Design a protein around this ligand. Sequence first.
Ligand SMILES: CC(C)CCC[C@@H](C)[C@H]1CC[C@H]2[C@@H]3CC=C4C[C@@H](O)CC[C@]4(C)[C@H]3CC[C@]12C
Ligand SMILES: CC(C)CCC[C@@H](C)[C@H]1CC[C@H]2[C@@H]3CC=C4C[C@@H](O)CC[C@]4(C)[C@H]3CC[C@]12C
Ligand SMILES: CC(C)CCC[C@@H](C)[C@H]1CC[C@H]2[C@@H]3CC=C4C[C@@H](O)CC[C@]4(C)[C@H]3CC[C@]12C
Ligand SMILES: CCn1c(=O)c2c(nc(/C=C/c3ccc(OC)c(OC)c3)n2C)n(CC)c1=O
Ligand SMILES: CCCCCCCC/C=C\CCCCCCCC(=O)OC[C@H](O)CO
Ligand SMILES: CCCCCCCC/C=C\CCCCCCCC(=O)O
Ligand code: NA
Length: 383
Amino acid sequence: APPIMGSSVYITVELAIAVLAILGNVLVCWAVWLNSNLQNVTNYFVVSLAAADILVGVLAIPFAITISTGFCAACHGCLFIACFVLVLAQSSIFSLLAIAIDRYIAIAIPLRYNGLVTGTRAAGIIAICWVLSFAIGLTPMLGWNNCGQPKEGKAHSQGCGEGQVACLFEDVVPMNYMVYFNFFACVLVPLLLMLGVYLRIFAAARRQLADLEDNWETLNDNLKVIEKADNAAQVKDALTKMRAAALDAQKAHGFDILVGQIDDALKLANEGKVKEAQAAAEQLKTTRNAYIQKYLERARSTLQKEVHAAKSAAIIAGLFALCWLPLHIINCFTFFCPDCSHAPLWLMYLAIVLAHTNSVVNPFIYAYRIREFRQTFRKIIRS
Ligand SMILES: CC(C)CCC[C@@H](C)[C@H]1CC[C@H]2[C@@H]3CC=C4C[C@@H](O)CC[C@]4(C)[C@H]3CC[C@]12C
Ligand SMILES: CC(C)CCC[C@@H](C)[C@H]1CC[C@H]2[C@@H]3CC=C4C[C@@H](O)CC[C@]4(C)[C@H]3CC[C@]12C
Ligand SMILES: CC(C)CCC[C@@H](C)[C@H]1CC[C@H]2[C@@H]3CC=C4C[C@@H](O)CC[C@]4(C)[C@H]3CC[C@]12C
Ligand SMILES: CCn1c(=O)c2c(nc(/C=C/c3ccc(OC)c(OC)c3)n2C)n(CC)c1=O
Ligand SMILES: CCCCCCCC/C=C\CCCCCCCC(=O)OC[C@H](O)CO
Ligand SMILES: CCCCCCCC/C=C\CCCCCCCC(=O)O
Ligand code: NA
């Protein structure tokens, strides 16, 4: 068929994706810029990622449309057209890894997270990540390209001038770079690191929930022990275990009452006043129902929240992988199997369109899983 027809379908889909990418990610940026409840370190990496997607629509997709035509161009200019999307993809990877690490710090060490992770260092990290993304993505421009061995015939058939080439991705970008350097080292390794980080996150959260329920169970079971005890030494056993568990749970003003009441009962148990020690320990039920239950519930709620936020971040990371892996896998076949027939052109553009689609989904994930983003989107739209 006349190449323009299939091209028209590919171009039309690309432009539609560009519109949606720009609109959605501009909305994310606007939401963070207005709402102070969304202005944190985590959402600063979210904005860095949104900027990458905005640039995908404004530059990467136009570049992709351009390089699909095979227009005559200087090989190094064609190279920039081809590799700029690699810059944006690498920036996305760094932002995703930063979010994963930020969440891990938030749950692993909630105490020092406020001082360890701050917005100033975050801005510096984002800057560095963009510089390294330009370095990685544009590494072919430094010499790892196929400009030294142009396809002279394909340049003459299209009437390209002296020093020009038919600007085609696989003609100028080496495939060993895309497979070994870009995919394996710069895409797959970071993603597997993110996987390990999120496993540590969820493992931690599960362990802390188990610790909370364990401390609640021990506090009630030793209460039963104190009830049915028969001598002062046994009451002392249960209470000593209690006191340690109390100063323990305090770490991860009502507790003051608790530990104090344990001390009262423990002193009276040391005086051989068994009976009055169970009464003094039975006072603990009051402190538990009014103070230790509320703490258990509030803490469990906060950890469930951290799990939810981590799940949202992992969803976006996984969607990034889902959208980009097909193109990388096609490159692996093009590189590792020269005996295989190259992936058909329609499948190539389907994979490119999918990678680009990734720049549209993140705003939707925010709106469907994060209430603050959802409500801010609503306010912006209604106005
Ligand atoms: C800040 C933003 C808006 C600036 C964007 C500038 C972009 C579009 C510019 C910067 C460098 C430019 C390229 C430089 C050299 C060549 C080789 C030539 O044979 C064809 C055009 C081509 C491939 C240019 C296309 C346009 C280009 C990519
Ligand atoms: C999916 C995540 C976990 C890891 C990525 C796995 C990738 C690197 C794997 C999955 C399937 C693999 C391909 C399966 C089959 C072939 C055909 C063979 O003649 C050359 C190697 C090649 C082309 C493999 C290269 C590596 C490959 C693309
Ligand atoms: C869900 C994501 C992560 C994985 C998707 C895997 C996709 C990209 C895989 C599944 C089957 C694969 C195809 C299987 C066979 C061939 C024929 C060969 O001559 C060229 C490559 C080509 C056309 C492969 C391209 C990549 C392919 C389409
Ligand atoms: C690094 C991410 N990536 C890619 O990895 C990539 C790609 N285009 C191709 C390949 C395009 C292509 C391959 C064979 C063709 O003809 C046989 C062809 O003709 C238009 C285009 N590849 C491998 N693009 C879009 C510019 C891309 O972004
Ligand atoms: C901040 C927002 C600003 C918006 C910025 C707009 C986005 C860039 C658009 C297109 C770049 C790709 C188009 C490059 C086409 C080159 C065609 C050309 O030069 O053709 C000559 C021919 O090949 C003889 O050799
Ligand atoms: C945000 C949506 C994007 C809108 C911007 C317009 C898209 C531009 C894309 C491609 C322009 C084609 C450039 C001309 C290449 C030379 C063609 C040739 O000589 O064969
Ligand atoms: Na992205």
